[PDB]
Amino acid sequence: SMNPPPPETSNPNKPKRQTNQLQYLLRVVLKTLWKHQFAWPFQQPVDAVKLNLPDYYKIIKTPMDMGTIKKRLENNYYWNAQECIQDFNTMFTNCYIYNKPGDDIVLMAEALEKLFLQKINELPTEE
Numbered sequence: 067s068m069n070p071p072p073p074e075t076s077n078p079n080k081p082k083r084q085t086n087q088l089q090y091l092l093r094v095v096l097k098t099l100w101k102h103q104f105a106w107p108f109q110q111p112v113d114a115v116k117l118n119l120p121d122y123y124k125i126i127k128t129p130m131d132m133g134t135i136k137k138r139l140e141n142n143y144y145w146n147a148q149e150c151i152q153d154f155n156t157m158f159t160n161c162y163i164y165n166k167p168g169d170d171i172v173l174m175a176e177a178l179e180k181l182f183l184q185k186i187n188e189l190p191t192e193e
């Protein structure tokens with residue numbers, strides 16, 4: 067029923083890159099999803115105490131959220147775009163696994179994921 071420590075967002079010994087694909091993931095992908103009217107439940111780690119979800123972290127072992135992704139992008143945490151893309155997909159998948167079809171939170175994730183898929187379809191060529 068307790069919250070775990072958050073996912074890692076800083077590690078000075080992890081090698082980093084600044085690339086046009088990662089720039090796109092922040093400037094287009096993250097920004098598009100973040101400003102959406104369904105973003106709010108996804109803008110920070112799931113607070114299982116606040117939301118009375120005592121079994122959430124019993125079930126979900128790789129938590130992920132856009133707050134974490136935002137910090138990772140803004141802090142240059144990643145080596146490549148696929149790392150970041152995986153974080154988004156983990157976020158959506160966690161939601162789908164924990165909840166039931168047609169749940170409000172699932173419909174919200176589905177709408178964000180539709181936008182996500184469109185932007186990723188348009189992922190720029192590597193410079």
Ligand SMILES: Cc1cc(Nc2ccccc2C)n2cnnc2n1
Nearest residue numbers: 106107108112113117161164165171
């Ligand atoms: C990503 C996510 C969020 C929530 N609940 C929620 C609702 C409103 C505001 C904040 C939060 C964290 N979830 C509830 N069950 N799975 C969930 N997944």
